[PDB]
Coordinates of C-alpha atoms and ligand atoms in Angstrom, one line a residue:
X1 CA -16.8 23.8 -11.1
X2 CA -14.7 20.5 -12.4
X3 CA -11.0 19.9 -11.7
X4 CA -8.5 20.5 -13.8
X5 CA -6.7 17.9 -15.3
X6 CA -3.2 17.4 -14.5
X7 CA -0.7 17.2 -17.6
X8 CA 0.2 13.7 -17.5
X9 CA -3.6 13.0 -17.1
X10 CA -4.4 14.9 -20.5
X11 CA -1.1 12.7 -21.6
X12 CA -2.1 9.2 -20.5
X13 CA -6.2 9.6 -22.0
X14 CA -4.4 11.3 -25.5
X15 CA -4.6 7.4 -27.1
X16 CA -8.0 6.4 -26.1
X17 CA -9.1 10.1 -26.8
X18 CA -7.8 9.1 -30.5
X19 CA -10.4 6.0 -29.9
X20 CA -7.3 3.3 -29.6
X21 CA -7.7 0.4 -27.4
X22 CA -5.4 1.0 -24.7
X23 CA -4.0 -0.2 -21.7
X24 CA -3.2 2.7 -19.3
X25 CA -0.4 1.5 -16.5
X26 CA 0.3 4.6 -14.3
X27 CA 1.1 4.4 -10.4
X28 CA -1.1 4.0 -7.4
X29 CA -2.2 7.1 -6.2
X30 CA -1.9 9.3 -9.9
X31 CA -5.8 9.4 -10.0
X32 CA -6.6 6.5 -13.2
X33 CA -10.4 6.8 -12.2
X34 CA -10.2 10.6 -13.0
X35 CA -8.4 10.0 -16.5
X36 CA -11.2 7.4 -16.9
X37 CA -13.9 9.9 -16.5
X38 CA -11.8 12.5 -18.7
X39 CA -12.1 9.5 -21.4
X40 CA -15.7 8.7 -20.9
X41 CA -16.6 12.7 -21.4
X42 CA -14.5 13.0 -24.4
X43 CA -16.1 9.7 -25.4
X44 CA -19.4 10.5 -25.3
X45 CA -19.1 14.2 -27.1
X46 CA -18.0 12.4 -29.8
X47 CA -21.6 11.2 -31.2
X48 CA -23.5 13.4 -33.4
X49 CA -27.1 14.2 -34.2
X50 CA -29.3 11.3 -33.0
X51 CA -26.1 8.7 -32.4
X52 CA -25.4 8.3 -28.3
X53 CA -22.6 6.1 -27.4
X54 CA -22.6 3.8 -24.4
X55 CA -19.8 3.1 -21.7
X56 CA -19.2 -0.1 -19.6
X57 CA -17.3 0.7 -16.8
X58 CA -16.1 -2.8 -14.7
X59 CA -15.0 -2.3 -11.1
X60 CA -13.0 -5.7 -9.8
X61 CA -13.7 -5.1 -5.7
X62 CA -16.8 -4.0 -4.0
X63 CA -15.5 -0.8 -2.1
X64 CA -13.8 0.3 -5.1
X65 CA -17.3 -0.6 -7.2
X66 CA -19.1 1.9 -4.7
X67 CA -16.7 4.4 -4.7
X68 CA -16.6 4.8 -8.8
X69 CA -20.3 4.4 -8.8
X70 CA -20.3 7.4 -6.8
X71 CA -17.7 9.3 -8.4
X72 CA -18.9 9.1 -12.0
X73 CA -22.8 9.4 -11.1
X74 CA -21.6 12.6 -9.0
X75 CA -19.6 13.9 -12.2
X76 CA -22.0 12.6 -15.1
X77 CA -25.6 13.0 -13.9
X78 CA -25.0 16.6 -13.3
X79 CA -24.5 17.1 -17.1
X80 CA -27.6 15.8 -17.6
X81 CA -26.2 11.7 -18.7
X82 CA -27.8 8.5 -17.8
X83 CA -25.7 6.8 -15.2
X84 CA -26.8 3.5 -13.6
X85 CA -24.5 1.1 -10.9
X86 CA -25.2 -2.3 -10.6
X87 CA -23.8 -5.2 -8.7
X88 CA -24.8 -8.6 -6.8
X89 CA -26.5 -6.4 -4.2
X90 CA -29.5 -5.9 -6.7
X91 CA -28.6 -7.9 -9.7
X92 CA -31.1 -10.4 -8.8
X93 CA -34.0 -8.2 -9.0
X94 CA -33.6 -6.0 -11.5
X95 CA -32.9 -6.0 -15.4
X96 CA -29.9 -6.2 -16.2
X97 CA -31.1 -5.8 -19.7
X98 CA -33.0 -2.6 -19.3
X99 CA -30.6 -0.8 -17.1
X100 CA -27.8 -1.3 -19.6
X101 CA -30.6 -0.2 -22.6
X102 CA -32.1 2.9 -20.3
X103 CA -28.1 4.1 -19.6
X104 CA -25.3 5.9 -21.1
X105 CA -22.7 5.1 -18.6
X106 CA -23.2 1.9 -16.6
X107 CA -20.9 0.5 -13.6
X108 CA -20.7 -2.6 -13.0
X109 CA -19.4 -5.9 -11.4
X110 CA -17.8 -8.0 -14.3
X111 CA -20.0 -11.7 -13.6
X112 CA -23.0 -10.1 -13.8
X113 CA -22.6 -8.7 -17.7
X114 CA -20.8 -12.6 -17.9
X115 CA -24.6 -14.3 -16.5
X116 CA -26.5 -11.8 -18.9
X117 CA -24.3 -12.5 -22.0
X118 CA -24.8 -16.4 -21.4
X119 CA -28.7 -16.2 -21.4
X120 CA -28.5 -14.0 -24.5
X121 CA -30.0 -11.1 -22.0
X122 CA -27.5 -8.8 -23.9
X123 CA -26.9 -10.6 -27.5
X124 CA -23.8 -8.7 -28.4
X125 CA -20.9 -6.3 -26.9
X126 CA -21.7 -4.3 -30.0
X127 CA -24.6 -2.3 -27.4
X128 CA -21.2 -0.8 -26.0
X129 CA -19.3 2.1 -27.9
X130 CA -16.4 2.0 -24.4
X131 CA -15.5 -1.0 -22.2
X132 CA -13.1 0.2 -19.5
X133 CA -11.6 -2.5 -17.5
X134 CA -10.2 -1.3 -14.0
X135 CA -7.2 -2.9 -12.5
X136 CA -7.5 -4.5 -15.9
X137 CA -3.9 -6.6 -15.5
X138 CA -6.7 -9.6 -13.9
X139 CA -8.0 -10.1 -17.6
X140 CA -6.1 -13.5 -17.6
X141 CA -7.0 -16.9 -16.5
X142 CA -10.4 -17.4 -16.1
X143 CA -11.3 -14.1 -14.7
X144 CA -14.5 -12.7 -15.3
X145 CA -12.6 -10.0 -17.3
X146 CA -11.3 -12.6 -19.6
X147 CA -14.3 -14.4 -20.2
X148 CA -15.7 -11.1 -21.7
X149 CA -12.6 -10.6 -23.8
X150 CA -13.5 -14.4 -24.7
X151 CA -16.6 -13.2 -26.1
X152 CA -15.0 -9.7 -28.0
X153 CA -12.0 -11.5 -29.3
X154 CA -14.4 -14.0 -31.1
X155 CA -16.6 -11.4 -32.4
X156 CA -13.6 -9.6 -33.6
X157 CA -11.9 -12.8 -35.4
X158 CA -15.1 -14.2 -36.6
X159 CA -17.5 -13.1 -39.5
X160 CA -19.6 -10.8 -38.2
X161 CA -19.4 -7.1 -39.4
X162 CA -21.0 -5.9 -36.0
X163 CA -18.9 -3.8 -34.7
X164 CA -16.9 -3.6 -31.3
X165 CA -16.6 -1.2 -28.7
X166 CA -13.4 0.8 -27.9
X167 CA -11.2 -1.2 -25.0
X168 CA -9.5 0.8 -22.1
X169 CA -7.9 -0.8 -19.3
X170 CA -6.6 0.5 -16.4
X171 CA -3.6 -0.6 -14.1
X172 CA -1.2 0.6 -11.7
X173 CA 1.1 -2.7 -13.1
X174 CA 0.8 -4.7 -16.3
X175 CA 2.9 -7.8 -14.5
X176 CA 5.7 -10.0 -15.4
X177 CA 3.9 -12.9 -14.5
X178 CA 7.1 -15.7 -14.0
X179 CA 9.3 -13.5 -16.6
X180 CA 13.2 -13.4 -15.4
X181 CA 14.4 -11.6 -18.6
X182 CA 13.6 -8.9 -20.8
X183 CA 12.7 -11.6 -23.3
X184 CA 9.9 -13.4 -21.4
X185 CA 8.2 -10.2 -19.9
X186 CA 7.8 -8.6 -23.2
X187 CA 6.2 -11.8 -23.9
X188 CA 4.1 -12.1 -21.1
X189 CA 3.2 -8.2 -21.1
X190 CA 2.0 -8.8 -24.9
X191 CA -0.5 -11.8 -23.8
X192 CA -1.8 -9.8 -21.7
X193 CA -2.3 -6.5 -24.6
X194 CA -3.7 -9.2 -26.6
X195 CA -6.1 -10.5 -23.8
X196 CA -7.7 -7.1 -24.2
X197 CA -7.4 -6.3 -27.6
X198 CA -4.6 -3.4 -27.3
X199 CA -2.8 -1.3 -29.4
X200 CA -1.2 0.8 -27.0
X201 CA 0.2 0.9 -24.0
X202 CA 0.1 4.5 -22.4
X203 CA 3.0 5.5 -19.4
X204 CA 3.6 9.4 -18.0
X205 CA 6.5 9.8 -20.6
X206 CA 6.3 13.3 -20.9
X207 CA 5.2 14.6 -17.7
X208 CA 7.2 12.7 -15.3
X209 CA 8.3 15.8 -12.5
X210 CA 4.5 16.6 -12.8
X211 CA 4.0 12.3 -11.1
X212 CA 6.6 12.1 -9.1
X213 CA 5.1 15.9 -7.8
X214 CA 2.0 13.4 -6.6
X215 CA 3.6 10.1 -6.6
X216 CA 7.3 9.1 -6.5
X217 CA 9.0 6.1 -5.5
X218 CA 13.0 6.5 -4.9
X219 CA 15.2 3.2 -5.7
X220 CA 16.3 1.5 -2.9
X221 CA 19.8 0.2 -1.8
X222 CA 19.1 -2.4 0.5
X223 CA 21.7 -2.6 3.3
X224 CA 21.7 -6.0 6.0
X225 CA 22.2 -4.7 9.2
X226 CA 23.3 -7.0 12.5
X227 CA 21.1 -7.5 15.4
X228 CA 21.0 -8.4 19.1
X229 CA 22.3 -11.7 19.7
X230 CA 20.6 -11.8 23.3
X231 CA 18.5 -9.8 24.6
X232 CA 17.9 -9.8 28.6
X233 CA 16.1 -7.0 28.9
X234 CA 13.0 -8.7 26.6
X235 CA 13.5 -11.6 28.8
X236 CA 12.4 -9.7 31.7
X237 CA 10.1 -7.9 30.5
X238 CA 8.7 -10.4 28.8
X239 CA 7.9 -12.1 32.0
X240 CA 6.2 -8.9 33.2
X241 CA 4.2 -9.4 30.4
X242 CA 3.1 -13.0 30.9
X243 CA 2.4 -12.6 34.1
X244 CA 0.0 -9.5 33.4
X245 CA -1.8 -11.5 30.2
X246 CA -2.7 -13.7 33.6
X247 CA -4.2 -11.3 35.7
X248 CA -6.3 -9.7 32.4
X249 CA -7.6 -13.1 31.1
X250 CA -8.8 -14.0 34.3
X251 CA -11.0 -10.9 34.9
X252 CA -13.8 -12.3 32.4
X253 CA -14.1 -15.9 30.9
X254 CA -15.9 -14.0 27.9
X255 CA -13.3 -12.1 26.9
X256 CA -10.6 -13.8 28.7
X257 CA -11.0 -16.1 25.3
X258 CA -9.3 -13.5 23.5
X259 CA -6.2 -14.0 25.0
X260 CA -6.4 -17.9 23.1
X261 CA -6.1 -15.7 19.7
X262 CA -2.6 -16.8 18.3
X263 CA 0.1 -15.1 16.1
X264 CA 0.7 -11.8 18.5
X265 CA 4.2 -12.7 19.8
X266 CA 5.7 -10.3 22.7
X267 CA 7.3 -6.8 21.4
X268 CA 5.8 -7.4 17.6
X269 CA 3.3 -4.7 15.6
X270 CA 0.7 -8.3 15.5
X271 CA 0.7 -7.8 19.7
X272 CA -0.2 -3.7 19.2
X273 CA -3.1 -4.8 16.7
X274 CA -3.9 -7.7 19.3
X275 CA -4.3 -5.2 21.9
X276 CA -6.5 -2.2 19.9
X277 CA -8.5 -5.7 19.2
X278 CA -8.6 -6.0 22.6
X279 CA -10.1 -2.3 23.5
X280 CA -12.4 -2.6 20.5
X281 CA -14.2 -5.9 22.0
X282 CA -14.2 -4.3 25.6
X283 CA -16.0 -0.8 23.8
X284 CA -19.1 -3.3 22.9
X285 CA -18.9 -5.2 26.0
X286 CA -22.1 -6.0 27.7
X287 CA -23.9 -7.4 30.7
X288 CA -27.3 -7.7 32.6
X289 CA -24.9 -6.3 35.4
X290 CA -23.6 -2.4 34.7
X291 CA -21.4 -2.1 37.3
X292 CA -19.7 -5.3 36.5
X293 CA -19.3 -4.2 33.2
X294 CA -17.8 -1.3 34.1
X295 CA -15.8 -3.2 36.6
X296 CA -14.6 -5.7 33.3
X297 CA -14.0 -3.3 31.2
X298 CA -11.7 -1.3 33.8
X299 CA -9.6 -3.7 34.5
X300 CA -9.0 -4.7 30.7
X301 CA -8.4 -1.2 29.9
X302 CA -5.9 -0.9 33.3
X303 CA -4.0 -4.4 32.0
X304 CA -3.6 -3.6 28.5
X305 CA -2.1 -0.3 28.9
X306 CA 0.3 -1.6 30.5
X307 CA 0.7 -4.1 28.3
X308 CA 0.8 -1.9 25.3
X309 CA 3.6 -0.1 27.4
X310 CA 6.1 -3.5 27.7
X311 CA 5.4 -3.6 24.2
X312 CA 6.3 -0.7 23.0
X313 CA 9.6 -0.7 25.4
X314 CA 10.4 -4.0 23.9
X315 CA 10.1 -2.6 20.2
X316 CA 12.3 0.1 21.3
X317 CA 15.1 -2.1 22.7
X318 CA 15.0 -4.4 19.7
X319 CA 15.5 -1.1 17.5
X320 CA 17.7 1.1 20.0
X321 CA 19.5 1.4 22.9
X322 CA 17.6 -0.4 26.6
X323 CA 18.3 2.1 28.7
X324 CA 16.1 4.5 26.2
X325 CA 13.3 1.6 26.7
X326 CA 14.2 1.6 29.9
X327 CA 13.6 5.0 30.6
X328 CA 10.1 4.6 28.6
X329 CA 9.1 2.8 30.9
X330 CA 10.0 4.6 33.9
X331 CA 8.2 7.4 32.5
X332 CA 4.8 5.7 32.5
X333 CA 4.9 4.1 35.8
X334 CA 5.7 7.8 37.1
X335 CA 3.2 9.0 34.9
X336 CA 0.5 7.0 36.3
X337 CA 1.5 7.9 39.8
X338 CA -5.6 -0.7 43.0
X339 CA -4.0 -3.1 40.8
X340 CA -2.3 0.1 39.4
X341 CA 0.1 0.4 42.4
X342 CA 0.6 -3.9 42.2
X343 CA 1.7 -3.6 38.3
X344 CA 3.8 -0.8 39.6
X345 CA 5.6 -2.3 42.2
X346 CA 5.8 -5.9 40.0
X347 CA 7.8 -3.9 37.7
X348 CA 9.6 -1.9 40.5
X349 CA 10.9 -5.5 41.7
X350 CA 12.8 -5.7 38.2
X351 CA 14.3 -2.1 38.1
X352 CA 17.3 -3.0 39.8
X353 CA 18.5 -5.7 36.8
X354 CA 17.1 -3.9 34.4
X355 CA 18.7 -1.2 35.3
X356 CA 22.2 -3.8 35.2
X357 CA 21.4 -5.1 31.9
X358 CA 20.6 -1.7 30.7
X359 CA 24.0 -0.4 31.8
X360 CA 26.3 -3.1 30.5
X361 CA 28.4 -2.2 27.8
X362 CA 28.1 -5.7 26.4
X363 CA 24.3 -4.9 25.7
X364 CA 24.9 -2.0 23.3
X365 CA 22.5 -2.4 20.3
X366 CA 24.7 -3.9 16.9
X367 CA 22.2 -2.3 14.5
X368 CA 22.8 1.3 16.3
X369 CA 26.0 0.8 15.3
X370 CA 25.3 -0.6 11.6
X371 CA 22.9 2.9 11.5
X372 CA 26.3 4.8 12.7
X373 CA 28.6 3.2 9.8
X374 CA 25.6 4.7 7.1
X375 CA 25.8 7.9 8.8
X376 CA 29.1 8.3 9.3
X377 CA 30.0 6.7 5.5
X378 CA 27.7 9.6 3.9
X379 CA 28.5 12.3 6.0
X380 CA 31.9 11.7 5.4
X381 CA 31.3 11.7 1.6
X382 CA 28.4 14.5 1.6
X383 CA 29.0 16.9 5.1
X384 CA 26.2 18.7 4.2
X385 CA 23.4 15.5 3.6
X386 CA 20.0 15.9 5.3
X387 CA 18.5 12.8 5.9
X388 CA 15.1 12.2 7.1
X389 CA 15.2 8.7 9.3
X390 CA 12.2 6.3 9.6
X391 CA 11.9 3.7 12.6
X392 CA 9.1 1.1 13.0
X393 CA 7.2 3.1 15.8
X394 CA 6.8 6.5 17.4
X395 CA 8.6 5.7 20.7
X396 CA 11.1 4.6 18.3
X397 CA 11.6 8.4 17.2
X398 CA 12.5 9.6 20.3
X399 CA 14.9 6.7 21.0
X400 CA 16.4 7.5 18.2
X401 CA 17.1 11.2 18.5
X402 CA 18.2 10.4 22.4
X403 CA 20.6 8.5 21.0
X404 CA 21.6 10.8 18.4
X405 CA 21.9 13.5 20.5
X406 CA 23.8 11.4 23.3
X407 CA 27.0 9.5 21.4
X408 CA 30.0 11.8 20.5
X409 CA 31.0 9.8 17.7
X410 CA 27.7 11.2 15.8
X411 CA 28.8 15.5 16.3
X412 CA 27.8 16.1 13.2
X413 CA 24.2 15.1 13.3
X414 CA 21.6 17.8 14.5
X415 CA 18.5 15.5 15.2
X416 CA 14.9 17.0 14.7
X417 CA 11.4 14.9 14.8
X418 CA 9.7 15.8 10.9
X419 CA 6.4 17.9 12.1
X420 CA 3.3 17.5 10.2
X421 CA 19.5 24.1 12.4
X422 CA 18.7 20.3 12.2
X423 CA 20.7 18.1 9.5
X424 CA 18.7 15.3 10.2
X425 CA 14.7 14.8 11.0
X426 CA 12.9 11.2 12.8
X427 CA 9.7 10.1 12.0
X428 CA 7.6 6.9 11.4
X429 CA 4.3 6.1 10.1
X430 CA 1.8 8.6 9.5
X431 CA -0.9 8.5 6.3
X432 CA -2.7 10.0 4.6
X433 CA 0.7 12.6 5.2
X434 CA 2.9 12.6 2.0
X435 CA 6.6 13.1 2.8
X436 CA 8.3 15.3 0.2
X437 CA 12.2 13.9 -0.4
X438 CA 13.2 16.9 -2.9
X439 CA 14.8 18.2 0.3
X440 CA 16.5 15.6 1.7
X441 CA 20.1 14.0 -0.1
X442 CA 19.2 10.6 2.0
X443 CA 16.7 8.8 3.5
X444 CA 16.8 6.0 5.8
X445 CA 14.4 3.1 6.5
X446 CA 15.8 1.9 9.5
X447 CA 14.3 -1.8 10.2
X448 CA 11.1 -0.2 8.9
X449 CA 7.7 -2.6 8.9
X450 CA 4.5 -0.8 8.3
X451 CA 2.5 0.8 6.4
X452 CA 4.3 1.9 3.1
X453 CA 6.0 5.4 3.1
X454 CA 4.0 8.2 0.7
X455 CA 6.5 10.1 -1.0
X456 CA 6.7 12.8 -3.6
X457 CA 9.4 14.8 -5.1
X458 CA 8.0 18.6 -5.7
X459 CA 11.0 19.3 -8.0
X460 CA 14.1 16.9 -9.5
X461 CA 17.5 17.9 -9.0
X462 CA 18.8 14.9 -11.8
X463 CA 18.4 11.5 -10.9
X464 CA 22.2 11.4 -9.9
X465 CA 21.5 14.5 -6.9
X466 CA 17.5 13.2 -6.1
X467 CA 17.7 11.8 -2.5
X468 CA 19.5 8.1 -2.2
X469 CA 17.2 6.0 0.0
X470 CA 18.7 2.9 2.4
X471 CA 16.7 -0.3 3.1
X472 CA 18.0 -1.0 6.7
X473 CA 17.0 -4.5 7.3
X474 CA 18.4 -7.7 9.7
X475 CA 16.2 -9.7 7.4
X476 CA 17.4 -12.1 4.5
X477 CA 14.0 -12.4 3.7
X478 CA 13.4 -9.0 3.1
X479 CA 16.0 -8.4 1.2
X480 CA 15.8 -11.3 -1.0
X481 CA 12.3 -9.8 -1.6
X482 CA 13.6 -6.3 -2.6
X483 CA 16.1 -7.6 -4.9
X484 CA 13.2 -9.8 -6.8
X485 CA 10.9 -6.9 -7.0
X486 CA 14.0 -4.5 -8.2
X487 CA 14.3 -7.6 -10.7
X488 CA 10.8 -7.5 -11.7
X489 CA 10.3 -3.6 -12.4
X490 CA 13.6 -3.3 -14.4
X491 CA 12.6 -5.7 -16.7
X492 CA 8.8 -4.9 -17.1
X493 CA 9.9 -0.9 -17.1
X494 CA 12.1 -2.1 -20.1
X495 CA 9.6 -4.0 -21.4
X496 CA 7.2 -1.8 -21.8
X497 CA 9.7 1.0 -23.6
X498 CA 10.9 -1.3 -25.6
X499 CA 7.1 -2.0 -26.8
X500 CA 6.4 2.2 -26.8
X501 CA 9.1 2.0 -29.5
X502 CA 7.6 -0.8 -32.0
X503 CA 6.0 -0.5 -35.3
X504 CA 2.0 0.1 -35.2
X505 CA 2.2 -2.7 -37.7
X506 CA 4.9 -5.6 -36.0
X507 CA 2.9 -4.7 -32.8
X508 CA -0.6 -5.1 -34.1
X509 CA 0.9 -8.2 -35.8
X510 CA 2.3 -9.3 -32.8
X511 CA -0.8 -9.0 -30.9
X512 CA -3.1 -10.6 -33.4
X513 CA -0.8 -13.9 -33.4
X514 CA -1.2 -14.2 -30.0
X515 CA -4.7 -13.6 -29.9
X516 CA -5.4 -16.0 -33.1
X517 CA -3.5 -19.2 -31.1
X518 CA -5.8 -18.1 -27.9
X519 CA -8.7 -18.3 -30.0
X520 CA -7.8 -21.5 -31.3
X521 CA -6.6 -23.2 -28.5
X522 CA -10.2 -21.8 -26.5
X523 CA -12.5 -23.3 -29.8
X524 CA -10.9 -26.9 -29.6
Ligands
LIG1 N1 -6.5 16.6 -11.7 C1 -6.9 16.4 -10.4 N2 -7.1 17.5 -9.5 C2 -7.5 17.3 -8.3 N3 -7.7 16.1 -7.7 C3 -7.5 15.0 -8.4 C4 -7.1 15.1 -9.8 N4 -7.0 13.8 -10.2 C5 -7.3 13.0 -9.2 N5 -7.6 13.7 -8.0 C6 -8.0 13.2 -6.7 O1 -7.1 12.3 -6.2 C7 -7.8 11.3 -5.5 C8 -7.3 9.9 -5.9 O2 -7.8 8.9 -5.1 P1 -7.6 7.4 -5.5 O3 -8.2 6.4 -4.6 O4 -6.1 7.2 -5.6 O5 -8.3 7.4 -7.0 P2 -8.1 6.4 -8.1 O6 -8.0 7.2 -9.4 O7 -9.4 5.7 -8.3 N6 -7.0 5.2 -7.9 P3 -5.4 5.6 -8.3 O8 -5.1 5.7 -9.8 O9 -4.5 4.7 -7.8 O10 -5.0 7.0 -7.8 C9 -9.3 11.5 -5.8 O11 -9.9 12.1 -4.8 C10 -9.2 12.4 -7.0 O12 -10.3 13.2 -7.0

C-alpha cells in the first residue's frame, strides 16, 4: 500500500494539481520527489477516453537520476504506466525518439532531450502534457535546462497554436543571485519564474509545524569566541606526530607516497580523513609476498592508530582543557598495554612536560571560558534552560562534560551525553539521526565544523519560546559567512511573500516582460 501524503505535500502540489506552471521551493529533506510523483499521478488521471498525457521528468546529477528512475518506475509501473529512464549511459544506442513515443513517464538527463530537439528527433515540446524540472533554480545561463525553456518560450511567444506542456520545477532555493536588497532579489527571483514560464511560486504556508516536524532550521546568533594564543601542548605532540609519520612512511615506498598527499595539517578533521584514506588503501593492499603484506599492513595500521590518537588529543586541547587531552591520551597508551612498546615509551619521555604545561594555570583554554559567559549569561536569565551542546568531535563530548562536571563556577549545570536530572546534554555529529530541539530552550554549536546538524521541532512553543541557537565560532570568516547567508534568506524569504501576495495579472505581466526582452535579446 502507498504512503500517505503529508499536509504540506497535498499543499505544495494544490497549484500544479490546478495545471499552473509552478515553481515549488520547499527545504532539503521535505520529500519534493514524492510531491512530484503525487503531481505526475494526479496528472495523468486527468485524460479522458482515448487522450493519454505524457510526463518529462529531468534529473540534474547522476545519483539523483538513478535514484528517481527507481523511485517513480517502482511507484508507476505497478499501476500498470509506461515508465522509461534514459541517460548518457545508453543514449547512444537507443531511440531517443521511440522511448519518449512508447512512454507515459520518461526520466531523463536534460542534454540528451537538448541533442534530440536539435536534429528534429523530437519536433516539438508539444509531445509533453508535464515537464518537471528538478533542482530547477539551474534553468539560467546556458544550462541545459535553459536551452529547453529557449525552445518553450519561443513556441509560446511565437505563432504557433501547438500547444505547451504544463511547467513544474522543483527547488529547495530559488536564489538571490548578487541581490543585496529586497528590490534586486524580487528581480532576480522573477527572471528566474520567467526562465521557466511560472505563474506561481508554491512555499509550506499553511502547514508549517507539520515541516519543521521533518525539517527545521532555528536562526542563529553568531557569537566570536577567543582562542589559544599558544599552545605547547600541540607543539609536543605534534612532534610525536612527525616523528611517527617517519617511521609509517618508511615501512613501504608504495604507500609510503601517501604520506606526500598535502592539505591534512596536525589536529585538523582533513588529517582524520587522511588517515581512514590511509586504512582504506592498506585494506586493498597487495603483494607477490603474503607475509609481507601482512607485515605492511600491520605496521600501518599500528602507526596510524596512534596517529589518529595525537589527533584526536590535539582537537581536544584546541576545543577544551589539555589535561582532558592529556588524559586521552594516557588512556590509550594504558589501553594498549614491538614498536607498540617504542611509541609508548617515545610518548612516556614527554609525560613529564606535558604533564607541566597541562597543569599551568596560564594554559587554561579562553574559549572554555567564552562557553562559561553563554552559560552563565542564560542561566542567569532562564534557571531552568536545557541546552543540548555540540563540539567538533566525540572525544570532544567527554572533554566537555569533564569539564562541566569539574569547575565550581558552572553548579548549575547537570551534564549528560544525548543517547541515540540532566539540564544539559553533549553530543556531536551523528546522521542520518535527527535531533529534535522542541525540548531544549538553547542550543549551542560550540566551534562546530562538520557535517550539518538535522534538526526538527515535533511541536512550536511561539517563535519567541522555540529554542535560541548560538554559533560559537573563533572565526571571522565564518561569521562573516553566517551574516551573508542570514542576509540572503531574509531578503529572498521576503521576496518571495511579497510575490505570493501579487495580482495574477501584474505578476503574469511581470513575467511576460521579462520573458519578451529574453526572447529578443536571444533572436538578435
Ligand atoms: N508522505 C511521506 N510519507 C513517508 N515517507 C515520505 C513521505 N514523503 C517523503 N518520504 C520519504 O522521505 C525520503 C526523502 O528522501 P530525499 O532524498 O530527501 O527525497 P527527495 O524528495 O528526492 N529530496 P528532498 O526534497 O530534499 O527531500 C524518501 O525516502 C521518501 O520516501
Amino acid at each position: 500500500s502507498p504512503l500517505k501524503p503529508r499536509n504540506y505535500q497535498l499543499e505544495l502540489a494544490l497549484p500544479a494539481k490546478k495545471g499552473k506552471n509552478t515553481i515549488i521551493c520547499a527545504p532539503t529533506g521535505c520529500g519534493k520527489t514524492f510531491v512530484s510523483l503525487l503531481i505526475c499521478e494526479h496528472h495523468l488521471k486527468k485524460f479522458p477516453c482515448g487522450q493519454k498525457g505524457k510526463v518529462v521528468f529531468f534529473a540534474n546529477q547522476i545519483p539523483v537520476y538513478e535514484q528517481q528512475a527507481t523511485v517513480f518506475s517502482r511507484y508507476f509501473e505497478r499501476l500498470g504506466y509506461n515508465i522509461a529512464s534514459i541517460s548518457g549511459a545508453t543514449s547512444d544506442s537507443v531511440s531517443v525518439q521511440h522511448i519518449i513515443e512508447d512512454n507515459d513517464i520518461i526520466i531523463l538527463t536534460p542534454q540528451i532531450l537538448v541533442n534530440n530537439l536539435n536534429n528534429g528527433a523530437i519536433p516539438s515540446l508539444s509531445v509533453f502534457t508535464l515537464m518537471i524540472f528538478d533542482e530547477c533554480h539551474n534553468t539560467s545561463k546556458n544550462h541545459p535546462y535553459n536551452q529547453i525553456m529557449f525552445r518553450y518560450l519561443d513556441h509560446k511567444l511565437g505563432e504557433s497554436r501547438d500547444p505547451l506542456p504544463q511547467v513544474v520545477g522543483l527547488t529547495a532555493s530559488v536564489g538571490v543571485g548578487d541581490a543585496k536588497t529586497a528590490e534586486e532579489a524580487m528581480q532576480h527571483i522573477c527572471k528566474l519564474c520567467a526562465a521557466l514560464d511560472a505563474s506561481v511560486i508554491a512555499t509550506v504556508r499553511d502547514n508549517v509545524a507539520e515541516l519543521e516536524q521533518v525539517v527545521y532550521k532555528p536562526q542563529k546568533i553568531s557569537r566570536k569566541v577567543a582562542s589559544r594564543t599558544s599552545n605547547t601542548f600541540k607543539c609536543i605532540i605534534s612532534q610525536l606526530m612527525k616523528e611517527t609519520e617517519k617511521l609509517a612512511k618508511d615501512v613501504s615506498e608504495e604507500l609510503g607516497k601517501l604520506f606526500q598527499i598535502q592539505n591534512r595539517e596536525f589536529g585538523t578533521q582533513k588529517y582524520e580523513q587522511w588517515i581512514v584514506g590511509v586504512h582504506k588503501a592498506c585494506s586493498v593492499f597487495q603483494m607477490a609476498d603474503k607475509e609481507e603484506e601482512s607485515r605492511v599492513c600491520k605496521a600501518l595500521f599500528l602507526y596510524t592508530s596512534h596517529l589518529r590518537k595525537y589527533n584526536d588529543a590535539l582537537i581536544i586541547s584546541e576545543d577544551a582543557q589539555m589535561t582532558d587531552a592529556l588524559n586521552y591520551l594516557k588512556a590509550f597508551f594504558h589501553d594498549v598495554r614491538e614498536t607498540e612498546r617504542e611509541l609508548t615509551r617515545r610518548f612516556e619521555e614527554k609525560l613529564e612536560e606535558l604533564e607541566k604545561v597541562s597543569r599551568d594555570p596560564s594554559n587554561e583554554n579562553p574559549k572554555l571560558r567564552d562557553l562559561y559567559l553563554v552559560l552563565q549569561e542564560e542561566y542567569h536569565l532562564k534557571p531552568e534552560t536545557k541546552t543540548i551542546l555540540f563540539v567538533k568531535t566525540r572525544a570532544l563530548v567527554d572533554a566537555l562534560k569533564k569539564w562541566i562536571e569539574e569547575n565550581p563556577a558552572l553548579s548549575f549545570l547537570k551534564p549528560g551525553i544525548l543517547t541515540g536530572d540532566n539540564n544539559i546534554l553533549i553530543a556531536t555529529s551523528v546522521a542520518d539521526e535527527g535531533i529534535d530541539i522542541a525540548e531544549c530552550n538553547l542550543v549551542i554549536l560550540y566551534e562546530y565544523v562538520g557535517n550539518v546538524i538535522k534538526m526538527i521541532q515535533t511541536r512550536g512553543r511561539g517563535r519567541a519560546r522555540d529554542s535560541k541557537c548560538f554559533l560559537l565560532t573563533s572565526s571571522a570568516d565564518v561569521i562573516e559567512k553566517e551574516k551573508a547567508n542570514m542576509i540572503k534568506e531574509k531578503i529572498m524569504n521576503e521576496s518571495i511573500l511579497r510575490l505570493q501576495t501579487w495580482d495574477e495579472m501584474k505578476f503574469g505581466k511581470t513575467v511576460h516582460r521579462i520573458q519578451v526582452n529574453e526572447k529578443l535579446l536571444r533572436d538578435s
